[model samples]
Target: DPKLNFSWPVNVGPLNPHLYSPNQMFAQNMVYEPLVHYNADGTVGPWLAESWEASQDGRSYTFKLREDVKFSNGEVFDAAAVKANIDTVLQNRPRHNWLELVNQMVSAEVVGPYKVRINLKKPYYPLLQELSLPRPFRFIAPSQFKNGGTADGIVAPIGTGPWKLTETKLGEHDVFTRNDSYWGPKPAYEQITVKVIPDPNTRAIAFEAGEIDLIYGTEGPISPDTFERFQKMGIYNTELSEPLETRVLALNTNHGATKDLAVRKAINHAVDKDTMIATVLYGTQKRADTLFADNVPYANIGLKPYAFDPALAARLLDEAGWTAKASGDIREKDGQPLAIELCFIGTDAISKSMAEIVQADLRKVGIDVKLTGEEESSIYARQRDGRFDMIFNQTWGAPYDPHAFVSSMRVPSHADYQAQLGLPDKAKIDAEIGQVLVSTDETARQALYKDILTRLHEEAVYLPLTSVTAMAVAKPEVGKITFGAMSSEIPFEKLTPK
Candidate 1:
């Protein structure tokens, strides 16, 4: 067996499958397998479960597990194991209220050695898609459960995937050994070293120094400029995955200046996505014309996108009674300046640069945009609490959107919910989304989505910027890099040494 070294800017965090965060979820998937696989084509496929059936009422799902599966520690992956894993996630429901499936799932029952049934509180057509997510739903060995159960914490990340957690050093790195007893394809590497070099420059240096075999993903070990440099060198294998998520600006419709439709509409037209992508992103990402890509299921209904027109933005402001005075460019109505704070994650270098571009763009239309760089934790708090007037919010990518993202819109804990507070049909919007989740009929479901998306598009609650892409750079010593179906993990098991 071969060996590989990978780089991420942060520690993989706890290796437990139930833990949150990007780094944690990525590492969890490497050691655990999902019952279902969400395909790149937006279809559900079998993984640990060989086959499945959904009840006509949409309240229940039955899964035929693969009897051949076994955990790294030799426990069988059966119907009972699925129930145990799901039970733990249900026990820790508050930790994952952001996921609708977790909220809707009532219980899991084992009918036979390799057959399981999942009961939902109500009909949810996206249950399987939620099951296919990399974290919180993926399985772990029941014997390894700790603190009474895995809800509080786990003893270790023992699972049925191709790798086993063999060693860890907190923020330094973690080592995984190939699980010889894995039920799936044997990993190409005998051991994988996830080198946690927190600095992007150092991570890039390690890759060049031959200590790291690959650097990958949307937010990263390397910036777009560095990725371009490596692409030009042509010495290493480099490729970008198809659009993964949409980067958009979410306006706080319930607060400050954005409360007015005209203000939100002006801000939408004020953005110049072409120049922003070309200059800030180095032309590495594609501009997003709609909230979700047309490829996403039911997202191609064809709503008109807002064009970049600062003059139109200015006119909209003027007609709405927000006028720029002779003394200053800032618009004022009723002694209130058309000013708002635009917040971004201070830690993300790209976001900081992107924020500045938006600040400058909005200024051209008499909008006083104040750039506020805050901690990621603080930004999440603001997003949930609706504390900021404007913020950089990205979509959860394919399959997760029409379901997960939209479902999240009904909860105050998610940014989507607060960002839509001013819509007259806000409750109606959530009602239709709820209906879409329950309906098994394709015609009715898609029509509901069209109505929902069209209203969102017309209201200008979001200024869609660009479709984000993930990049992979691997040295010649390493095998060809292939991205996983979801950005949560890398396709380490599929890689073959060069």
Candidate 2:
């Protein structure tokens, strides 16, 4: 029998990890390994590279490779392969690839056949943590390419992990078989079938009908009441873990009305953070106004959310000369309506609901927000092209490091790889980042981080909503599913069928 009767409302279309970004779409911890892994409590765990040592300056890291590992295609994993894989990922620049982590990598030298040394320009605090990013950022095979190969989407999939792809039909189901000769731990049964069902209701219905053993949510939009119903059934077990994901409203600093700090603050003040969490996330998320999640380094505790006060919002807007007209709507002093297009990427059930809630709340405060639910890629491109007034996107669990969060919405440039988000004061952020990186003292680093996350909130660059958690329905016999700070890995080997 198969390891588990895995079925879903959707099917896996493209097996290429390079193009996929979502946790559900590219969640391949079991199929593709990384240099390091993490435990259920979001701490580091052992994976491909058994052990490693970081330099004092954090600019260099030496990894001692494991001996028993081999690629799915049987290529020996050597120092050269490690360096090659890294180089390929960088060159390919996969949308989901963790380039910010290795921005300091100057060169990777094969110190020995089984050992490799990676040199960086400066100390990268989150180097090891970034190694834990899910698929599209994991290891790749050396021979999968036709010419000088890399981890590009065009190349065939070849990875060293616990499972191997058996069959995958584009836009259809993709099947994987357990690696009997797996080095670490053999999986519970024999195989797993990941089907990508795009429709939310169908996905829920299929799970309820017992057609699928587990209901996986990348969108994580299964209603809490519905999830509780499944959990109430003894045969199916429900699990919860805090995800690294964040729901954010990214302001278009390049736009007109949003370009003004007072206007942006008014919008922030208008948002009912508590109501949004209750209605959209079903009260499962923390009302966040800062970047740091509970698990990350330098997460400040005293920071308070922007208390939802429509009166305060109105006052701020009025002070900025965006007075409401007879229709109870806001307009600039010159009669220009306070309207802007707000776009949310993809049909992930939660994002859709969150976007709707945001639009309604903003509208009540006399803000004209046109919500566009579209493909994530198109949305990202739109944001990149300055087409929208604001976008919704956030990086989940960038390896327990504050720099990871700092750099994501930061200016997308090399010089400011670890810069702060939204705020235009580059000089202040630049100095802060430099100071934190120079010190190895955890206390000092944490203090600096507190300041950074605070500054981001004060500037209102990326408006933080809540840190959404994850839930999964599994068989009773399935092993306890654990997670790193920001991973969707449900340990398959832990499943022991009677």
Candidate 3:
């Protein structure tokens, strides 16, 4: 019998660590191990690499690799292996956005069989934390690389973790057997099977039918309405995470009516976050107005949300010369109607309903928001090509620091939220973000971050929405599921059967 039976809401795309999202990491975590372990309380400790030291300038890091380690495939774990994985990730650039974390890396050299020195072009405080991430940096057998290390995906899924990839059926399920040769504590189970069930209700139904044991939601599996009903049954155990994720209406900043600062502010003032969270999420989430979650380190406590006032929103639009037209409900500025398309992942019912609510709210303020529901891939494609006016997106917590999330949004070349909005003072914003990376002093870094958030608030770069309360439902015997500071996926290595 399978020691543990779990199901994911999405397909196990490819076991390649470099290509998986955190949602996909639920399966990947079992087969891959990173240099450091991210603990539940947002603190990092040693794992594959026992210890590491950063240069005074913070540009170089030397990791003392574990000496008594071997891959599941009997390959030696050493500095050369680490270099190979890192170089492979760097070479496959633009395909994975997380590579930006190591974009400054000049080289990773094998100083010794048990030591590796990674040199970066500049001081980046979050380098160690980024390396601690399980994907892209996770160790795989060097032999998996093919055709002179230029293969698109790993030839075989291999890692030094507590479990081994025994069998895989694409779009169905993955079977992992215990790695008896693991260098660390062996997993408690003989085997674990991860089933790919795309529908949340079907997954829950399977869990109820005893066909599956655990259901983790990185793609929001459990509905708030069903959660209470399941809780009362006393058959399932639920763990609701602290509101650590942020959802926002990411306004396209580069063009469209959102380019007007007054228009952005008007939209922010128009949509009521409290009503949205209560109506759409059934009051299971919290209102959020800033980049940092309330539980994250260095969050600006005094920052307040914009009060929802349609009159004030209309005034802002009026000030921006977007006057309500007598002919129709939509407003017009410079002979152009105040209309823009808002898109969301059509597969997500919550997002679709949220878009509908937003459309209704904007209509009240004389702004014509055309809503488009598309598949996840199509939505992302539009986002990358600037084809959409706005979209619903969430940013996961930067457990180590806010820089990790902010850099992607603010960096002009990244062309994300800030660039899309065409923030005129990008140089100043970049300087503040750059200082946060260089300054090791906690207070100094916090001050710089505060300044950046303050500017974002004033500029209305994003229409702040809800801070999500992540949840999971499982059979009572599934026991405690723990998460790392940066990861939402439960670490199967630590997960045990009751």
Best candidate, lDDT: 1
Question: Which order, best to worst by TM-score?
Answer: 1, 3, 2
Model 2: pairs clashing at backbone N, Cα or C within 3 Å: 9-197, 10-196, 10-197, 11-196, 13-171, 37-45, 58-123
The deviation in Å at residue 423 for candidate 3 is: 6.4
lDDT per residue for candidate 1 within 1-498, as digits (tens), equals: 788898877777667788776447778888888899887666788999999888888888899999899899888889988888888888888998778788888889998889999998888888877888887888888988896577667777888999888988878888989999988778778998988888877876787789998888875445788787778887998877767789888888898999989999998888898999888887668888788877676787988878888889999999999999863489999999989999888988888888898889999889889888988899989988898898888888855866767778887778889989988899999999878888988899899999999988888888888888778889876766777767775888888887
- Rank list by lDDT: 1, 3, 2
- Scanning candidate 2 in windows of ten residues, the lowest lDDT window is 413-422
For model 1, the superposed segments whose C-alpha errors exceed 4 Å read: 9-14, 19-23, 73-75, 88-98, 143-157, 167-173, 220-234, 252-266, 295-297, 309-349, 365-389, 397-399, 411-421, 477-480
Candidate 2 residue-wise lDDT, 1-498, digit = tens: 655656444454334444453224333665677778755444576678888888776778888989888887777877787887677656665443356565556777888888888787777666666677674446666666546644334365566777777887655577878877777777777888776566766766777676667654444445665565676676677776664667677776656577767767777888888987766655556676665565665564577767778888888877888878755775555678888777776587777777777778888778887888889678656765666677776655545446654554445522122222335775676677777765666787778777776776776666677766666777666556543345455555556665
Superposing all C-alpha atoms, what RMSD in Å does each candidate have to the true structure?
4.1, 6.0, 5.2
How many steric overlaps are in each model, in order? Answer: 0, 7, 4
Report the lDDT tens digits of candidate 3 across residue range 1-498.
338888876665557766755236756777788898765445567999999988887788899999999999899999999989878877776655445566778888898888999898888767766776767788788888766453366688788988888887877887889998999987777887888887767876887889887665533566776565566687678776655668788776677988888988899899877887777776667787775665565564577777888899999998889998663468988899999899888888888888988999999889889989888778767776777677776775645446666767655433255334477776788777777877766688778777887777777877878876656667777788764455444666677778
RMSD of 2: 6.0
Better of 2 and 3 by TM-score: 3
Better of 1 and 3 by TM-score: 1
Model 2: lDDT of residue 377: 75
